[PDB]
Design a protein around this ligand. Structure first.
Ligand SMILES: Nc1nc2c(ncn2[C@@H]2O[C@H](COP(=O)(O)OP(=O)(O)NP(=O)(O)O)[C@@H](O)[C@H]2O)c(=O)[nH]1
Ligand SMILES: [Mg+2]
Length: 172
């Protein structure tokens, strides 16, 4: 079983920290452009495009939507000021052809949302983020879920990936 995933979210949301929690055991810095992570996790081989989240890299994200099995979207739940930017980016990505497309089996591309930095002062819960972003209206027919996460420790992360992998398997 092979999964291709694109990982999106604003700069400093915790994308790279989170993906490193699911990689094999063997210094994180801001991701310039993107990085491809290819690794095994359990019985699955993952290919993850860990996108840079700075404004200047967001134009790249769409290059990696082709044939994708899932989107992972990481929100800094403690960054209230840019929740409007999070919303516009989710809106922008949903309009793209490769995200819109009906999957081979009739399904729609699934989204795993992380409400990350659950430990940070001022963190909003998954429920609060759904209401603020009006996420349910935005996501429409796309299957999605949202879990509070702590990327430093791995809280929420592993369960999110179970959801992604089970949803992908069911769809393929
Ligand atoms: N307190 C706390 N800090 C976190 C959490 N997740 C990530 N961080 C911290 O937030 C900073 C940004 O993390 P990073 O993984 O580089 O974020 P990113 O989304 O890949 N940034 P970019 O889009 O620039 O590549 C790092 O200092 C990291 O340790 C969390 O859940 N809680
Ligand atoms: Mg990064």
């Amino acid at each position: 079983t092979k999964l291709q995933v694109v990982m999106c979210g604003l700069d400093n949301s915790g994308k790279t920290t989170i993906i490193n929690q699911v990689k094999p055991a063997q210094h994180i810095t801001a991701t310039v452009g993107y990085n491809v992570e290819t690794f095994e996790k359990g019985r699955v081989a993952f290919t993850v495009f860990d996108m840079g989240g700075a404004k200047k890299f967001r134009g790249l994200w769409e290059t990696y939507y082709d044939n994708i099995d899932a989107v992972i979207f990481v929100v800094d739940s403690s960054d209230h000021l840019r929740l409007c930017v999070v919303k516009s980016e989710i809106q922008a990505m949903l309009k793209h052809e490769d995200i819109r497309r009906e999957l081979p089996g009739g399904g729609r591309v699934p989204f795993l949302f992380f409400a990350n930095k659950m430990d940070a002062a001022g963190a909003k819960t998954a429920a609060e983020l759904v209401e603020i972003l009006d996420l349910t209206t935005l996501m429409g027919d796309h299957p999605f879920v949202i879990f509070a996460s702590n990327g430093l420790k791995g809280t929420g992360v592993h369960e999110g990936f179970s959801w992604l992998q089970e949803t992908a398997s069911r769809q393929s």
